[PDB]
């Protein structure tokens, strides 16, 4: 019954600030402390700081103090964490977690799903979809480059799913404030270009559904 539901993903421009929440339930909110952890895809986990709902006491990790402020709302069993003077260094997923007292110190027994924060000035923008055909202009590999979109996610399928095996859709990467990803499909030499091969990329945020046919040359 112990649950910690954190806020939804966040999008903010540098120099700005943000405030995320962590709603607790299933236990006595003021009887346990809340810690915040930071996870950028590289490094591991970093301890930001801790707060005591009961007394509002807060302890910060020196590295994160100054730009971070932990608060709490006892009437809604919600802890908040505000980040200021944001930079791309603040782009990561943040977790809140409950602390429990065993022996001399504490440990985190329950964590939230996490909150994703992306610091950038990009605005919702559809990807360009480029077809990747063999280069001479039994098994044949073909691709599809989904470049310049924001924000994630994007959905790629080949021939609307009628081609499942032999597909690898790669994680997107930050190519200048914009995301870029690729996807490849492998089919027998008898199907292409004998038949059609189309990648279908959808980008919910921009309400875009693009179908790109892979034709020979370049």
């Amino acid at each position: 019954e112990v649950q910690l539901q954190q806020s939804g993903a966040e999008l903010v421009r540098a120099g700005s600030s943000v405030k995320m929440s962590c709603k607790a339930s299933g236990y006595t909110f003021t009887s346990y402390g809340i810690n915040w952890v930071k996870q950028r895809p590289g490094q591991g986990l970093e301890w930001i700081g801790y707060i005591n709902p009961g007394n509002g006491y807060t302890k910060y990790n020196e590295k994160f103090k100054g730009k971070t402020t932990l608060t709490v709302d006892k009437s809604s069993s919600t802890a908040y964490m505000q980040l200021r003077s944001l930079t791309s260094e603040d782009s990561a997923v943040y977790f809140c977690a409950r602390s429990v007292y065993y022996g001399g110190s504490y440990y985190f027994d329950y964590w939230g799903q996490g909150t994703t924060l992306t610091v950038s000035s990009a605005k919702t923008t559809p990807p360009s979809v480029y077809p990747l055909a063999p280069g001479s202009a039994s098994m044949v590999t073909l691709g599809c480059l989904v470049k310049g979109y924001f924000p994630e996610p994007v959905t790629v399928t080949w021939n609307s799913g009628s081609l499942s095996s032999g597909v690898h859709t790669f994680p997107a990467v930050l190519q200048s404030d914009l995301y870029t990803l690729s996807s490849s499909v492998t089919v027998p030499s008898s199907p292409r270009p004998s038949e059609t091969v189309t990648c279908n990329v959808a980008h919910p945020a921009s309400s875009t559904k693009v179908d790109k046919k892979i034709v020979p040359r370049d």
Binding site: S31, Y32, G33, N52, G54, R98, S99, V100, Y101, Y102, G103, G104, Y106
Partner: peptide, 8 residues
């Protein structure tokens, strides 16, 4: 070995 148990 043993306890001290339910937080803060």
């Amino acid at each position: 070995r043993p306890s001290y148990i339910s937080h803060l």
